[PDB]
Amino acid sequence: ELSFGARAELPRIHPVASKLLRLMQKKETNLCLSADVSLARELLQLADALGPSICMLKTHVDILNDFTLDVMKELITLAKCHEFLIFEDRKFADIGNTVKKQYEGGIFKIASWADLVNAHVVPGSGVVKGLQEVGLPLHRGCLLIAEMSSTGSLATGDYTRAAVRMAEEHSEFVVGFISGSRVSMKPEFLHLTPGVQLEAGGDNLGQQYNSPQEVIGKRGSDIIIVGRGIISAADRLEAAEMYRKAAWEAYLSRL
Amino acid sequence: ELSFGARAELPRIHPVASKLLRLMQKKETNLCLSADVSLARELLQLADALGPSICMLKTHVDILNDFTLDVMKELITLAKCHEFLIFEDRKFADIGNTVKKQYEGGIFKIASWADLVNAHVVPGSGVVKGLQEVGLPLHRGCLLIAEMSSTGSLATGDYTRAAVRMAEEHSEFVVGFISGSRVSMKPEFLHLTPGVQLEAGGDNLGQQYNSPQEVIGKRGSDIIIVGRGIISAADRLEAAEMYRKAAWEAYLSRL
Ligand SMILES: O=c1[nH]c(=O)n([C@H]2C[C@H](O)[C@@H](COP(=O)(O)O)O2)cc1I
Numbered sequence: 001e002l003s004f005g006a007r008a009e010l011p012r013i014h015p016v017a018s019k020l021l022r023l024m025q026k027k028e029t030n031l032c033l034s035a036d037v038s039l040a041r042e043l044l045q046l047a048d049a050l051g052p053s054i055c056m057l058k059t060h061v062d063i064l065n066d067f068t069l070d071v072m073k074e075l076i077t078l079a080k081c082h083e084f085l086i087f088e089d090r091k092f093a094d095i096g097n098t099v100k101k102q103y104e105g106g107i108f109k110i111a112s113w114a115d116l117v118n119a120h121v122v123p124g125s126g127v128v129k130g131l132q133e134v135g136l137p138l139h140r141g142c143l144l145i146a147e148m149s150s151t152g153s154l155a156t157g158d159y160t161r162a163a164v165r166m167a168e169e170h171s172e173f174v175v176g177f178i179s180g181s182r183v184s185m186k187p188e189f190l191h192l193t194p195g196v197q198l199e200a201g202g203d204n205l206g207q208q209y210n211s212p213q214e215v216i217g218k219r220g221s222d223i224i225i226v227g228r229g230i231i232s233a234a235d236r237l238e239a240a241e242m243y244r245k246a247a248w249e250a251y252l253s254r255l
Numbered sequence: 256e257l258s259f260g261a262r263a264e265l266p267r268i269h270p271v272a273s274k275l276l277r278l279m280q281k282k283e284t285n286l287c288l289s290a291d292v293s294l295a296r297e298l299l300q301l302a303d304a305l306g307p308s309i310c311m312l313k314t315h316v317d318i319l320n321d322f323t324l325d326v327m328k329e330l331i332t333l334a335k336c337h338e339f340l341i342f343e344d345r346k347f348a349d350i351g352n353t354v355k356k357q358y359e360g361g362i363f364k365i366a367s368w369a370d371l372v373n374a375h376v377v378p379g380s381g382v383v384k385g386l387q388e389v390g391l392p393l394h395r396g397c398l399l400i401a402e403m404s405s406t407g408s409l410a411t412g413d414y415t416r417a418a419v420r421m422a423e424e425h426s427e428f429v430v431g432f433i434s435g436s437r438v439s440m441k442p443e444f445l446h447l448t449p450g451v452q453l454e455a456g457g458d459n460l461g462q463q464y465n466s467p468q469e470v471i472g473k474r475g476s477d478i479i480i481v482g483r484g485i486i487s488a489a490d491r492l493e494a495a496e497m498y499r500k501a502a503w504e505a506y507l508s509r510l
């Protein structure tokens with residue numbers, strides 16, 4: 001088992017993952033903020049104030065009521081300044097020819113500013129083949145949804161094993177997974193785990209929480225994705241630090 | 256076997272499906288046009304010209320380079336004039352509390368203009384439950400993706416069975432399926448099938464095509480979703496009429 005910093009230097013490491021692994025070690029943060037907000041200003045305020053505590057900011061640019069590409073210009077500014085990756089949670093999940101256009105085009109032009117995006121594997125390997133054609137040119141990485149935190153999730157057993165396989169066979173573009181635990185034995189791949197809170201619980205619509213120590217420590221994931229656990233707190237700065245320190249110590253203990 | 260007109264009067268049938276099935280019968284079309292264009296003027300020129308030939312227009316708003324809510328207004332006007340339903344192929348595939356926001360809010364405000372939307376079942380029923388909460392107020396309906404057309408598709412066997420159960424258990428809002436064949440024998444559910452062309456073949460990124468006669472005639476589907484088969488033609492109207500006549504005669508032969 002290697003440190004994040006050692007993993008950033010592996011032969012077969014993808015550059016986007018290496019950049020991420022290096023700033024993870026530098027900042028002592030395996031925390032990804034989920035910024036689920038309705039206003040551009042909200043997003044840029046939060047990113048800036050919490051930037052120092054995170055390795056990655058996960059966006060839903062399709063829930064911004066005042067999206068513009070200038071808003072994402074200013075997001076990249078803050079990303080370069082505080083050193084975090086931008087991860088648009090698009091969950092591309094269609095045939096290759098469609099996801100191509102969705103990734104490069106339309107009003108969002110996701111490929112022009114997202115270091116990472118994710119994709120569901122249900123369509124088969126064409127969803128990644130399609131995304132690759134936009135991603136490789138623009139030096140980007142993708143994450144494959146191998147597991148989900150929601151109750152009734154069908155991403156289990158054979159489905160999970162297919163997501164890993166797909167990943168291993170597209171390593172020039174796929175840098176890791178969305179998962180509830182470590183699912184690949186290859187240290188080149190990242191693991192990011194949503195459904196994370198300090199306290200036991202869920203929400204009213206299928207979400208189920210596990211703690212950072214459980215997820216990073218016992219389940220062997222690398223990064224925790226945390227939204228309401230931080231945004232809904234009174235002190236979002238203090239909240240982000242708690243999750244950072246929890247996930248960071250769990251990682252240290254694991255080494 | 257019942258006709259679209261009879262099925263539209265079924266006791267346990269959704270207001271949206273009933274509306275759809277009546278205009279199908281009235282207009283003699285079970286063709287959904289997949290308008291995968293990136294200019295609003297071409298979308299509206301196709302909608303206007305091909306309106307009378309179609310029971311439904313399937314959109315990908317997020318690939319339109321010049322989307323405005325005013326464009327959708329004009330699309331709605333054409334849809335009323337020519338009697339077709341608007342279906343946004345958004346493929347909701349996140350947790351319930353997330354998809355609610357993507358469905359209602361943000362720049363696209365899909366719920367305000369889309370008669371139907373679709374969702375993947377991989378997250379568990381929470382995804383349907385989240386969408387339901389927004390759509391039921393507005394009398395919308397939802398299609399669940401039970402099978403896919405592309406090579407390597409993991410929407411098979413128990414995954415499909417899962418989508419059927421989830422649909423049946425949420426009939427108040429799920430009006431049917433995106434699938435390759437009839438997967439539900441319950442006549443209140445609509446079956447819609449993409450990966451359709453007249454000629455045998457496929458594309459370079461996993462898309463596989465069967466004919467209207469195979470899909471409607473042998474596999475028992477209701478409606479064909481056809482993109483490039485029409486869009487790539489010089490005369491898109493002649494092509495639409497060709498797909499319409501093929502799919503409609505295939506339907507009449509099942510009775
Ligand atoms: O399997 C998943 N689970 C999940 O929670 N998300 C997203 C949805 C939400 O925006 C965030 C979870 O944040 P909370 O910590 O607020 O639940 O991660 C995405 C996937 I794929």
Ligand SMILES: O=c1[nH]c(=O)n([C@H]2C[C@H](O)[C@@H](COP(=O)(O)O)O2)cc1I
Binds near residue numbers: 095098449481
């Ligand atoms: O399983 C699927 N298969 C599929 O083909 N589409 C959509 C994607 C595209 O917009 C259209 C196919 O267009 P062609 O008929 O040009 O392949 O159907 C959606 C799903 I879910």
